[PDB]
Design an enzyme around this catalytic site. Structure first.
Site, PDB file in Angstrom:
ATOM      1  CG  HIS B  41      10.204  12.775  -8.776  1.00 17.41           C
ATOM      2  ND1 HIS B  41      10.003  14.134  -8.884  1.00 17.41           N
ATOM      3  CD2 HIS B  41      10.487  12.541  -7.473  1.00 17.41           C
ATOM      4  CE1 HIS B  41      10.200  14.702  -7.705  1.00 17.41           C
ATOM      5  NE2 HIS B  41      10.498  13.758  -6.831  1.00 17.41           N
ATOM      6  N   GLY B 143       9.490  21.821  -4.411  1.00 19.37           N
ATOM      7  CA  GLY B 143      10.794  22.187  -4.908  1.00 19.37           C
ATOM      8  C   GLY B 143      11.949  21.738  -4.043  1.00 19.37           C
ATOM      9  CB  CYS B 145      12.513  16.645  -4.814  1.00 20.10           C
ATOM     10  SG  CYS B 145      10.944  16.188  -4.156  1.00 20.10           S
TER      11      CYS B 145
HETATM   12  C1  LIG Z   1       9.744  17.355  -4.805  1.00 24.12           C
HETATM   13  O1  LIG Z   1      10.206  18.712  -4.778  1.00 24.12           O
HETATM   14  C2  LIG Z   1       8.478  17.132  -3.989  1.00 24.12           C
HETATM   15  C3  LIG Z   1       8.722  17.384  -2.492  1.00 24.12           C
HETATM   16  C4  LIG Z   1       7.371  17.383  -1.780  1.00 24.12           C
HETATM   17  C5  LIG Z   1       6.578  18.652  -2.061  1.00 24.12           C
HETATM   18  C6  LIG Z   1       5.942  19.041  -0.725  1.00 24.12           C
HETATM   19  N1  LIG Z   1       6.689  18.292   0.268  1.00 24.12           N
HETATM   20  C7  LIG Z   1       7.505  17.390  -0.283  1.00 24.12           C
HETATM   21  O2  LIG Z   1       8.248  16.649   0.334  1.00 24.12           O
HETATM   22  N2  LIG Z   1       8.052  15.754  -4.181  1.00 24.12           N
HETATM   23  C8  LIG Z   1       6.892  15.454  -4.760  1.00 24.12           C
HETATM   24  O3  LIG Z   1       6.114  16.310  -5.169  1.00 24.12           O
HETATM   25  C9  LIG Z   1       6.513  13.999  -4.903  1.00 24.12           C
HETATM   26  C10 LIG Z   1       6.670  13.619  -6.380  1.00 24.12           C
HETATM   27  C11 LIG Z   1       5.269  13.387  -6.935  1.00 24.12           C
HETATM   28  C12 LIG Z   1       4.293  13.505  -5.775  1.00 24.12           C
HETATM   29  N3  LIG Z   1       5.083  13.911  -4.605  1.00 24.12           N
HETATM   30  C13 LIG Z   1       4.649  14.241  -3.366  1.00 24.12           C
HETATM   31  O4  LIG Z   1       5.446  14.587  -2.507  1.00 24.12           O
HETATM   32  N4  LIG Z   1       3.362  14.261  -3.006  1.00 24.12           N
HETATM   33  C14 LIG Z   1       2.409  13.287  -3.315  1.00 24.12           C
HETATM   34  C15 LIG Z   1       2.672  11.920  -3.190  1.00 24.12           C
HETATM   35  C16 LIG Z   1       1.648  11.023  -3.519  1.00 24.12           C
HETATM   36  C17 LIG Z   1       0.404  11.497  -3.932  1.00 24.12           C
HETATM   37 CL1  LIG Z   1      -0.957  10.398  -4.362  1.00 24.12          CL
HETATM   38  C18 LIG Z   1       0.165  12.855  -4.041  1.00 24.12           C
HETATM   39  C19 LIG Z   1       1.168  13.747  -3.733  1.00 24.12           C
HETATM   40  C20 LIG Z   1       2.924  15.300  -2.171  1.00 24.12           C
HETATM   41  C21 LIG Z   1       2.334  14.976  -0.954  1.00 24.12           C
HETATM   42  C22 LIG Z   1       1.895  15.982  -0.104  1.00 24.12           C
HETATM   43  C23 LIG Z   1       2.049  17.312  -0.470  1.00 24.12           C
HETATM   44 CL2  LIG Z   1       1.483  18.606   0.644  1.00 24.12          CL
HETATM   45  C24 LIG Z   1       2.639  17.642  -1.687  1.00 24.12           C
HETATM   46  C25 LIG Z   1       3.084  16.635  -2.540  1.00 24.12           C
HETATM   47  C26 LIG Z   1       6.239  12.212  -6.801  1.00 24.12           C
HETATM   48  C27 LIG Z   1       6.634  11.701  -8.192  1.00 24.12           C
HETATM   49  C28 LIG Z   1       5.807  11.145  -5.792  1.00 24.12           C
END
Ligand SMILES: *[C@H](O)[C@H](C[C@@H]1CCNC1=O)NC(=O)[C@@H]1[C@@H]2[C@H](CN1C(=O)N(c1ccc(Cl)cc1)c1ccc(Cl)cc1)C2(C)C
Ligand SMILES: *[C@H](O)[C@H](C[C@@H]1CCNC1=O)NC(=O)[C@@H]1[C@@H]2[C@H](CN1C(=O)N(c1ccc(Cl)cc1)c1ccc(Cl)cc1)C2(C)C
Lengths: 306, 306
Positions: B41, B143, B145
């Site tokens: 991603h 950040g 990931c």
């Molecule tokens: C990558 O650095 C990041 C790690 C996240 C950021 C905060 N804690 C983590 O583990 N990963 C992501 O941002 C992924 C990535 C897009 C969305 N996402 C994600 O973690 N969140 C998310 C998932 C589904 C939905 Cl509908 C909305 C957000 C996310 C969830 C909670 C929080 Cl507090 C932040 C981000 C991908 C492509 C799924």
């Protein structure tokens, strides 16, 4: 989000760890530039450890008695001296992996990472706090002496602890890297006791703020209290007094959550008088006191180290 | 003595961590030999992440779109391909710090260390278990990931986890290093939910043995139980069934303490039905389930890593 008891990355310290053997004692040393630091009780035999005169014991030693083993490379010792409760073994090779470093002494209530080692080989890393009674609740087996505690600031390793002994309650005692013990302990195989501990109040409040940041809010209340009336409750539950400087240090966490420090004190007062009633906070059923305000801000903000 | 949640020394993994930037997304990559592994991603924009077709997105990319940053040295990307949910960026330099390694997939109930990273720089290390529902309870900010989870066996790093996302309950989901998700999660910014978890029974028993080894004995009893009658109690408190293989794996801890596995089960049964009544076990007021029998034997025996 999430909150974990987190250690510093240990690579910079791993490259400093060596094995020191003298007689039948093997322990760990810390190799920085051309000096290896290690607990002075390496020079003791079994019956030496009961009431040793370390100056007498050391004058009877030779450089060649100290076997220093860095991985699979032997380090020739070319000088030795004692500084308080540590030995400084001067070697003929400077450690090419020496990080930028400092020797700092920490305060009770502060945290650090421990790289547990055996035979000069790192085994695991974990986070410790200096208790108010100058002990640490570590994980240490035979041969772990000379393992160090440290913090990392940006690229600089601040060494604050070297391990020396275990006390009868199973807690641990050691020195700063100048060889000066934390607390009223001595490197003698005699009966010593920790002395009464207390809970680190400012750290518990920091951890409550960590909880709020991470969505645990059930312990919050509309109530407030004065600093003096909180400290009356703290004394009764064996908590350290909270000072205005502690209140100041918690300012940024207070501003991020919108919860006044003294309001969080009222919450802590209720938790102390009522317990938790079957609920948890950040996965714990106890009030946790080994996270500093800095540890909370670092983890709930994301600072790294290069 | 002592018992701490202990991570592996992280130095071998620190030397593999790089920064990967594409467009406006920056995350971490894992650099082994001449390949950098990172979550796919990274190729997504903000509106790409809602329902991405990654094959379509990737064919529109060029090698020069991927900025790989190893400390203060830029790595030129000379090829790219997708493997399941990870990207493999082939670079023109082999990592001279590549440890001996394996890509392994772990089972729920197993533990590993996580090196949390931001901008390719390691921030902290901590121990995690794979939950029965294939999530992990981590500590991850924006950040993070591409941070990896791993175990170390003697000198070999077994990578088992790469971080991808956070779920709505604040737990974390990711892949093995072949890019295959743990559990029924997808790398899409859509509403997903963890699914019900259970407590890892064999790990709780291992931790009770750790406690006994360290002198906590108050929860012991003369009572015993059958495996079938224990599992009736386990089901009711949402604990995983205990198998004969779990009993076998606990054999060495049983023999060291002299407490039969099924006797410790009777103790656990009483703790589940009565609670702890104000007491603690190894500093916890909850039954802890993120230590495997291996973790207990390792720490309560002292294995290292060279
Ligand atoms: C990558 O650095 C990041 C790690 C996240 C950021 C905060 N804690 C983590 O583990 N990963 C992501 O941002 C992924 C990535 C897009 C969305 N996402 C994600 O973690 N969140 C998310 C998932 C589904 C939905 Cl509908 C909305 C957000 C996310 C969830 C909670 C929080 Cl507090 C932040 C981000 C991908 C492509 C799924
Ligand atoms: C150094 O490797 C070792 C580290 C110890 C071993 C187990 N856990 C540890 O932290 N340090 C020592 O062995 C020191 C060393 C002699 C005695 N000692 C020590 O820790 N123990 C001890 C202290 C006082 C008395 Cl009267 C008896 C023993 C000790 C306590 C508990 C246990 Cl389970 C083992 C050893 C020096 C010179 C004080």
């Amino acid at each position: 989000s999430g909150f974990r008891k987190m250690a510093f990355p240990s690579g910079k310290v791993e490259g400093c760890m060596v094995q020191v053997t003298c007689g039948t004692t093997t322990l760990n040393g810390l190799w920085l530039d051309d000096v290896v630091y290690c607990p002075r009780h390496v020079i003791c035999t079994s019956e030496d450890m009961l009431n040793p005169n370390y100056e007498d014991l050391l004058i009877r030693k030779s450089n060649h008695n100290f076997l220093v083993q860095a991985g699979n490379v032997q380090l020739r010792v070319i000088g030795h001296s004692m500084q308080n409760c540590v030995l400084k073994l001067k070697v003929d090779t400077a450690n090419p992996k020496t990080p930028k470093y400092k020797f700092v002494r920490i305060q009770p209530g502060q945290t650090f990472s421990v790289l547990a080692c055996y035979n000069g080989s790192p085994s695991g890393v974990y986070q410790c706090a200096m208790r108010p009674n100058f002990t640490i609740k570590g994980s240490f087996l035979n041969g772990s002496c000379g393992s160090v505690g440290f913090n990392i600031d940006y690229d600089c390793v601040s060494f604050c602890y070297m391990h020396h002994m275990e006390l009868p309650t199973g807690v641990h005692a050691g020195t700063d890297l100048e060889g000066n013990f934390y607390g009223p302990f001595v490197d003698r195989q005699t009966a010593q006791a920790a002395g009464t501990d207390t809970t680190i109040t400012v750290n518990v409040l920091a951890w409550l703020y960590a909880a709020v940041i991470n969505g645990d809010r059930w312990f919050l209340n509309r109530f407030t209290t004065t600093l003096n009336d909180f400290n009356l409750v703290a004394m009764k539950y064996n908590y350290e007094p909270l000072t205005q400087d502690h209140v100041d240090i918690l300012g940024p966490l207070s501003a991020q959550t919108g919860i006044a420090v003294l309001d969080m004190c009222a919450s802590l007062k209720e938790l102390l008088q009522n317990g938790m009633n079957g609920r948890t906070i950040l996965g714990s059923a106890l009030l946790e006191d080994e996270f500093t305000p800095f540890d909370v801000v670092r983890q709930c903000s994301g600072v790294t180290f290069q």
